Design an enzyme around this catalytic site. Sequence first.
Site, short mmCIF file in Angstrom:
data_model
loop_
_atom_site.label_atom_id
_atom_site.label_comp_id
_atom_site.label_asym_id
_atom_site.label_seq_id
_atom_site.Cartn_x
_atom_site.Cartn_y
_atom_site.Cartn_z
N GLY A 39 -66.30 -10.60 11.25
CA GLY A 39 -66.60 -11.43 12.41
C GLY A 39 -65.33 -11.69 13.20
O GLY A 39 -64.27 -11.92 12.61
N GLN A 40 -65.42 -11.67 14.52
CA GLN A 40 -64.23 -11.90 15.34
C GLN A 40 -63.64 -13.29 15.13
O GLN A 40 -64.33 -14.21 14.67
CB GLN A 40 -64.56 -11.71 16.83
CG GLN A 40 -65.48 -12.78 17.41
CD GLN A 40 -66.95 -12.48 17.20
OE1 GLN A 40 -67.33 -11.78 16.25
NE2 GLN A 40 -67.80 -13.02 18.06
N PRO A 41 -62.35 -13.46 15.43
CA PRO A 41 -61.72 -14.77 15.26
C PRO A 41 -62.52 -15.76 16.09
O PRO A 41 -62.97 -15.44 17.19
CB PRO A 41 -60.32 -14.56 15.83
CG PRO A 41 -60.05 -13.11 15.51
CD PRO A 41 -61.36 -12.44 15.84
N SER A 43 -65.49 -16.89 15.44
CA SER A 43 -66.93 -16.83 15.17
C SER A 43 -67.40 -17.93 14.22
O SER A 43 -68.52 -18.43 14.35
CB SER A 43 -67.34 -15.45 14.63
OG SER A 43 -66.62 -15.08 13.47
N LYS A 45 -66.49 -17.90 10.44
CA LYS A 45 -66.75 -17.28 9.15
C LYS A 45 -66.87 -18.25 7.98
O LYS A 45 -67.33 -17.88 6.90
CB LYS A 45 -65.69 -16.21 8.87
CG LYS A 45 -65.82 -15.00 9.79
CD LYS A 45 -64.81 -13.90 9.45
CE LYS A 45 -63.39 -14.28 9.87
NZ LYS A 45 -63.30 -14.51 11.35
N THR A 46 -66.46 -19.50 8.20
CA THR A 46 -66.57 -20.50 7.15
C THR A 46 -68.05 -20.68 6.81
O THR A 46 -68.40 -21.05 5.69
CB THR A 46 -65.96 -21.83 7.60
OG1 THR A 46 -64.53 -21.69 7.70
CG2 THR A 46 -66.29 -22.94 6.61
N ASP A 66 -54.19 -15.67 4.97
CA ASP A 66 -53.46 -16.69 5.71
C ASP A 66 -52.95 -17.88 4.92
O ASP A 66 -51.90 -18.44 5.25
CB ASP A 66 -54.32 -17.20 6.88
CG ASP A 66 -54.46 -16.17 8.00
OD1 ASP A 66 -53.43 -15.61 8.42
OD2 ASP A 66 -55.60 -15.92 8.45
N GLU A 99 -52.86 -8.98 -2.15
CA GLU A 99 -53.24 -7.82 -2.93
C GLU A 99 -53.03 -8.06 -4.43
O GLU A 99 -53.81 -7.58 -5.25
CB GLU A 99 -52.46 -6.58 -2.47
CG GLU A 99 -52.89 -6.08 -1.09
CD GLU A 99 -54.41 -6.01 -0.92
OE1 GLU A 99 -55.09 -5.33 -1.73
OE2 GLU A 99 -54.93 -6.62 0.04
#
Lengths: 270, 272, 85, 87
Positions: A39-41, A43, A45-46, A66, A99
């Site tokens: 989803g774009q920044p 949007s 997503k939370t 982040d 990672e």
Amino acid sequence: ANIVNFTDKQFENRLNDNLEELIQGKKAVESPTAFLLGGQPGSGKTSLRSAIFEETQGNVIVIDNDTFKQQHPNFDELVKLYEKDVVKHVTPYSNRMTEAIISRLSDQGYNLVIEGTGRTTDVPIQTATMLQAKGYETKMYVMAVPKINSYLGTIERYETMYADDPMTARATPKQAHDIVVKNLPTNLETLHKTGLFSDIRLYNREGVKLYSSLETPSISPKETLEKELNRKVSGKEIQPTLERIEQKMVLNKHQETPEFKAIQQKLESL
Amino acid sequence: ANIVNFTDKQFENRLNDNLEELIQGKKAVESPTAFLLGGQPGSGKTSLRSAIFEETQGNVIVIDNDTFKQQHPNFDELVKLYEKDVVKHVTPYSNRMTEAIISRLSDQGYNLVIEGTGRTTDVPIQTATMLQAKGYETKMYVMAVPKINSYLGTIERYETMYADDPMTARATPKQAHDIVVKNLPTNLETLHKTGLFSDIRLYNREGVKLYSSLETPSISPKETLEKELNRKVSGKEIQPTLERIEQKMVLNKHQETPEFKAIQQKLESLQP
Amino acid sequence: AVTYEKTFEIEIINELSASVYNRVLNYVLNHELNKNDSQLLEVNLLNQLKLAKRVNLFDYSLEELQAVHEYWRSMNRYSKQVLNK
Amino acid sequence: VTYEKTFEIEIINELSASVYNRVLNYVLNHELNKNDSQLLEVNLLNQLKLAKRVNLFDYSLEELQAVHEYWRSMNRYSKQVLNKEKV
């Protein structure tokens, strides 16, 4: 090199604390599931995290790149040297930490949520493939939100962070937002074709499931997502957000910006 | 229904949390010791806590009545209802809780520090007698501070508390301070005579032990305390305190008071 | 079954808390403090933040979320004073 | 020990008791499960318990002033979170 660098010991001490924090109240399982987000920044997503937390009855770990940036061992010195332009200097650390955590947690079998935008297909494909090799089922839950609403969201997020801490607040380039908006639909169809994901879903901000490849296998996620992204938002629906943002920008003394002026017109144009 | 009252259940739940809080990090011992403190308000008795903490290597529990006053189940309502004169209304609760805590902790055998002013001889006598019946060694450590320094202490304390919270700050009625100054010297001699306390000590504001009945059993604590209480303090010594008080009173906008006018007058006379 | 207003509050909380927690963790670690010694001012603070973070924000009302947000604003301010003597 | 540090400690102890007691009273009055750290007010109570376990006599004047600010901030914060009404 030098201060932007860090020892394996410094990395290790941080990795261990990160792991300790993330596994709290969590338990590895036989058939783990990994949910890659998209989803774009802006949007929201939370909302996806909420839906997944519910699905897994809380037994899931969220990996968000982040959250590790300011964890660079020499963050303080780096900030004194680069101030607001410090981000680029610590991203390598955050990437490596992210990672390392995914690798460790996936080795143990915890259900995972991996923060992401879906800007590209190579990243999620790579991640999903690596995880399936460890016995994971992989899903992809994505936000389907009108581009105007997500864009305003990037602005509101910034202004709110600014109000909290003027020092570290940094806006989301509209280009970064627009690039995801432009490629996401096509990218999801591409991911649909790989068959790597047991289910690809689209959600709105209220956690409502708008699409599920598992439920409608022959329906591509593309058109449905595009429709939402380009949906014309009514003034009645947008006015409240505009005013809320407007008031925050006034408080932040950000009236002399194209963003504030555009909100004024778009608002007075109602 | 009278908000001043509380159920035994309310008392019990608070008592339980208090005990859990107080015993944290401490351990009961085979031969416990209790330290009864003494000293007028503003004399800086916390200094005594420091010395005792050191003596017991940190294994001691401090019991302070004042820490339970706002713990009254209906403290908020009582504060709006009685406002400034609320303390006398929550003392029944705090006194009851303080005695319950002392009782429970002494039953176990933890080393204890009991905050007090030494206004009377009977309270510490009854307390020490009760403790000794539970296997305690009982001592008495007291602050010996000039009456001017302790009085100024009560003002600095009030103004400092006021700065943190105007609603929580409460001034020390001068009588509360003066009565203790008047009773203490004689009271300490009376206590010395009982032989109940293995050691009665006097400490100055800096932590210096000025007297010890254990070391000089034939010397009364009275004269030594009276000498310090009546000691004439120089322009200096109090100057820093006067300055700290002025800073707080300016911040609190309390310049229009006799105290403030007195502080500035004194400070002015101390200038080069 | 969520609202945008609350999920937005949660997103902000997640970013702010990370910043505050990392600041304290970093100091504790670059200073070699015993993470098992709650007597140390910075470690005690770190442990309080750990306790604060262990919660599930999806189980809080809007008012509670706004409170948590203020909690982190307050710790952001406090941590800066405690660490930067 | 100095009078300056001793005084700072006396103020801290008075203020902390005020803040802790406010929180304890609320938790008990609302019959909140004290063993449920998910409950916002109980989480705060537990943090305050953690704060109170320290030995202030081992702190420098600077550390005491920081502790003093901690309690000032929690004094402010507690007044906000203790939102629910009732007896």
